Each structure stands twice: as structure tokens, then as C-alpha cells.
């Protein structure tokens, strides 16, 4: 499809940068939310869709 | 055969003229052109396609009484429809007639002299027209007229008889159709002030890159505190978090337009360089009461403050307009000068790669170093304006892109950050006296 | 120019105007931009004010 | 000469054996079996760019 030949995005919010380590945690709760017995999440957000903020998740 | 020297000296005072970031497009339901945009560069020229009357002349005279003034005003017209019906009963041997123009210069009277047969044999005539019948729709129950098929414009006019006319369009085709034959102009204003249409562009705009302008003299608006309870048009703006709309609550906003007056003071400047609080707006009263036509009290002010309306406050003996913040919390200042960071760079890119005429800019670390500089150099402009004080770019390595991304020529995965710097606009102060 | 050392696309061309819809003189939307591209067609797309061919 | 031009940026070739072709080829003095591969040097004509403003 016809795309902008220069593509600008701007947004108010704020982030932080990431590093890389030895092992990555993991969170075992009671939930049935999803089938997987186990997912990823790259960030506070995604983690709001599967879960609300009473959640222990 | 021309002198020398020629020589004027025309006895009229004048301005000078100062462009900055966007210019205005006033949005008003009219007929006085086919053409569903046009631009006029003074006051004199509106004059010509429009009388003392009309909105849009009111627009037009209240944008060019700030100094400097605007280089250039644009003007959209919106869909209409007409209505026709008899004001007499059906009587014989009495006249009754009217004329039907459409777009493309046509027009063709349509004559019955002799209360719904009349307007039945108006509707036959034009629908047996050869040409009006192509491009235009009747309905009969009083008479109704509106487009037909592609046509764009529609007139009607005619003692026997009478004639009224409409907004056909909504906010949403209304913008489309506009956008679809211009698309430079920045801030947007709107003639007609009722709630559906009002909020039907505001959420519009908020999915596109410009500023909504708008003003509003619902009593209601004064009243209510709690944010949670009110619901005039002010608050349900605020509560939907329409970062990109501006209201100014005045008494005047039925027949006059301060919101091209508001425009007018910031729009010659630069953006990302001015505050748009405490503005001085020439010609413009302060914010009165309906009833008693008084300044407004303190606790009407602060009903005003929790919607995130703006007012026209009076310090002392001196009208300001007040923290000229978008209904969703901004400042307006931000919003303006984010969209003209955008534009800079977005120009500065295209710059970059237009005019490799004769070469290349080849897929490797050297390639995206020269990408790597004309940001950093953008963003150093706007570091210069005194609107960010500091800034960070991050590029990707050549031996790590994709390889769906060298195939299609497209360099992705560039981010960069940047901090505000802030103003002054109010002050607290505390002292004491003594011996 | 010499073979292989030149991009074709985005390039400039003196005098030739921008591709218009026959029917009103404006510049082709994106939708119909995109019909263009399906079909592998080329077109000369507008930047802010500067006709380019843009795929080549 | 293509790479010089940054028209590529590497190459190989491979050729048989003189002493594993077909008896059949040197009688008819044809050379088969002689290939080679090259690499794209690419270029860029669109960018993406993201970012974010913040106190």
C-alpha cells in the first residue's frame, strides 16, 4: 500500500531504556484469563489487557 | 510606454503582515460560491463575495483586527438543502414560480401559474428537465431539494412562494469533502454552534494533526463543580480527553466570533516560542453574565477552571484571555509545537533523500550515519527555539536490519526522546510590615 | 549516468506536474495511490510541494 | 568492476574439474557447469521514525 516516504510519530508519554542480563523472571498466579500456561509481556500495558488492577498478576 | 519614475502616495494607512505555523480555515454554511474552498488575503476582498451580514464576514473582520496580522484566510463551504412551500392557500389564476441552479453555471426557471399541486408540478417539470433532472432530488409531502448523484452545488430562489434553506452535511462528510480539495490550513473553526455538530469535529479533528477552535455561552457551564455531574458541551469535551480542542466560553459566541480573534494572536508567530496565556486581544470585552451583564464572579471562573475552559478574565481594568489550555490538559503551546517538530523533520528527511540525484544512499553503517545527523540537527533547531533543552537519537546497525526491509528500501526502528523547558504565568507572593 | 550506481526512485523531473484525477484537476488520493501500487505502476507523488516519482 | 561501482559487495565462482568433466564435452569443446553468486549492495528511499516528549 502507498506509504508516506518519511513517517513522523510524536506522543507526550514517557519511557525508559532496557538492559540485558543472566535469566528472566516469572510469575506464578491462579488465573484462567488465557488457555497458554504461559505468556510473555514486554510491558506494563500489554499486561493490563489480560489483567485489571486489582489483580495480584 | 511607462515613466520613469512612477510614483503612488495612496492616502490610506497600513500594516505590516508576519506568517508563522498554519493558517486558518473558517468553516460556514453558504452559497455564495461554487468552489468549496477559497482563499482571500484582506478584509476588502471578503467584502466582495460576502456582505456586513453574513458569518463569514464577521470571522473575517474579527481574525484581522490583531497586529501583526495573518497572511492568509481560507474559506469552506458546507452542503445545503432548501425547503419550499406556499405561504397562501392553492388559489387559481395566481403566479408561482422559482429558479433551480446547479453546479456548472446552469439554471432553469420553472413556472405554474395556476397548496401540494403546485409544488407536484414544480417536481414533474424538474424531473422531466433534461438536465436538472440529472443532478438534483425533490421530495414532496412543503418541497425538499438537495444534491443528486455527483453534483456539488445547488441554489434555490425565487412572492407567492417561499424558500428556506439548511446544513445538509454532518461534521464528518462536511470535513472530508473539504479536506478532499485543500489540505493546507492548520486551525479550523466552525460557524454552526450546536452540541451534535460541535462534538462530531472535535472528534474528528482529534484524529488528524490540527487545532479545533470554538466558543459557547451555555448558562449551564457556570454552574456545576463537580466535573462528574455536568454535561453541558464544555464538560463532555473535557471528559472525553479531546487533547486537540480549544473552548472559550463568552456571552457574545451566538451572532460574533471571537475564536478567529484568539487565533489571530498566536498564529503569526512561531511555534513552540510563545505562551497563549494571558493574551491580550484587541477589540474583545471580557467575559460577561447573560443576566445582569456583569463580569463573572470568582466561583463561575472556578466552575469554568475544573472543565478546562478558557475565559476572558479582567485583572484590574485589563481583559486576558486565561491559560490557554486544550480541553484535554494541555497547554496549547505543546500541541503546536510537537505538529511543527513533526513538519521540521518530516522536511528535513525529505530534503535529505529527494536530492541524490546521480547516487545513492547505500544500505550500511555510513548510509545511516547521515540519517543519524539531519535528526539530530532538526532537533538541535527546535533546542535553539528555547522549546525543548535537551534530546537523544538511537539508530539500528547495518548488519542487524532484515531482510524484508532491504528488499523493500525502508529503514526502520529510529526513536528519539526530548524534555520540555517551561514558562512563568502566574505569582504568589507574601510579606509583612513593621516597626 | 553509468549502470547500477543509481536509485531510480524519488527522482525529480523539470516541468512535468504531478499526476491529477482527469476529472477535477487534484492530486491522486492515497486509495487511489494504492491501486497504483498493486498493479506495480508509477506515478509522480507529491512531497510538501515537490513532484517525485517515488518507486521506480 | 560491478563491486568497484558499489553495485554489489562480494562474490564467488566455481569451475570443474579438468579431470572429472565428461569425455563427451572436451570432444565437443563446450565448457559447462560454470556458476557464480553476488550480493546486493541495496539502498534506502523511505524512513520510520518514532519519539516522545516528556518533562
Not at chain 2, 451555555?218 to 479531546?242: C, F, H, I, R, W
Request: hydrophobic content about 40%; some cysteine; charged content about 20%.
Amino acid at each position: 500500500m502507498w506509504n508516506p516516504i518519511v513517517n513522523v510519530d510524536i506522543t507526550l508519554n514517557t519511557a525508559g531504556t532496557t538492559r540485558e542480563g543472566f535469566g528472566l523472571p516469572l510469575f506464578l498466579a491462579s488465573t484462567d484469563n488465557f488457555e497458554e500456561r504461559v505468556r510473555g509481556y514486554t510491558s506494563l500495558t500489554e499486561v493490563a489487557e489480560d489483567f485489571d488492577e486489582n489483580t495480584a498478576a | 510606454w511607462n515613466p520613469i519614475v512612477n510614483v503612488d502616495i495612496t492616502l490610506n494607512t497600513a500594516g505590516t503582515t508576519r506568517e508563522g505555523f498554519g493558517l486558518p480555515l473558517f468553516l460556514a454554511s453558504t452559497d455564495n460560491f461554487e468552489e468549496r474552498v477559497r482563499g482571500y488575503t484582506s478584509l476588502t476582498e471578503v467584502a466582495e463575495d460576502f456582505d456586513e451580514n453574513t458569518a463569514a464576514y464577521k470571522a473575517a473582520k474579527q481574525l484581522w483586527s490583531q497586529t501583526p496580522k495573518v497572511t492568509q484566510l481560507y474559506i469552506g463551504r458546507r452542503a445545503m438543502q432548501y425547503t419550499v412551500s406556499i405561504p397562501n392557500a392553492v388559489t387559481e389564476s395566481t403566479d408561482y414560480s422559482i429558479t433551480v441552479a446547479a453546479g456548472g453555471g446552469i439554471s432553469q426557471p420553472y413556472q405554474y401559474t395556476a397548496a401540494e399541486n403546485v409544488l407536484q408540478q414544480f417536481k414533474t417539470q424538474i424531473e422531466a428537465d433534461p438536465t436538472i433532472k440529472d443532478k438534483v432530488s425533490v421530495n414532496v409531502t412543503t418541497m425538499i431539494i438537495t444534491k443528486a448523484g455527483d453534483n456539488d452545488f445547488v441554489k434555490v430562489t425565487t412572492q407567492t412562494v417561499y424558500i428556506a434553506s439548511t446544513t445538509a452535511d454532518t461534521a464528518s462528510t462536511a470535513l472530508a469533502a473539504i479536506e478532499a480539495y485543500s489540505t493546507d490550513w492548520y486551525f479550523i473553526a466552525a460557524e454552526d454552534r450546536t452540541q451534535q455538530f460541535v462534538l462530531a469535529m472535535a472528534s474528528e479533528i482529534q484524529a488528524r494533526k490540527k487545532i479545533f477552535f470554538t466558543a459557547n455561552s451555555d448558562v449551564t457551564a457556570l454552574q456545576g463543580t463537580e466535573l462528574a455531574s455536568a454535561n453541558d458541551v464544555p464538560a463532555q469535551l473535557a471528559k472525553n480527553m479531546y487533547t486537540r480542542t480549544v473552548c472559550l466560553w463568552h456571552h457574545a459566541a451566538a451572532e460574533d466570533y471571537p475564536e478567529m480573534a484568539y487565533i489571530a494572536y498566536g498564529a503569526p508567530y512561531d511555534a513552540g516560542s510563545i505562551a497563549w496565556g494571558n493574551a491580550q486581544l484587541t477589540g474583545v470585552a471580557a467575559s460577561l453574565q447573560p443576566s445582569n451583564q456583569r463580569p463573572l464572579t470568582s466561583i463561575q471562573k472556578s466552575a469554568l477552571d475544573v472543565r478546562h475552559c478558557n475565559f476572558i478574565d479582567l485583572d484590574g481594568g485589563v481583559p486576558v484571555v486565561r491559560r490557554g489550555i486544550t480541553s484535554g490538559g494541555e497547554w496549547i503551546d505543546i500541541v503546536r509545537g510537537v505538529d511543527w517538530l513533526e513538519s521540521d523533520l518530516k522536511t528535513s528527511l525529505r530534503d535529505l533523500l529527494i536530492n541524490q540525484k546521480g547516487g545513492k544512499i547505500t544500505y550500511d553503517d555510513t548510509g545511516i550515519t547521515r540519517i543519524r545527523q539531519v535528526i539530530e540537527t532538526s532537533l538541535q533547531r527546535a533546542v535553539n527555539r528555547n522549546f525543548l533543552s535537551s534530546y537523544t537519537v538511537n539508530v539500528p546497525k547495518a548488519s542487524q536490519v532484515a531482510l524484508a526491509d532491504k528488499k523493500a528500501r525502508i529503514l526502520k526502528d529510529v526513536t528519539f526522546a526530548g524534555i520540555l523547558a517551561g514558562a512563568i504565568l502566574d505569582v504568589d507572593l507574601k510579606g509583612t510590615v513593621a516597626y
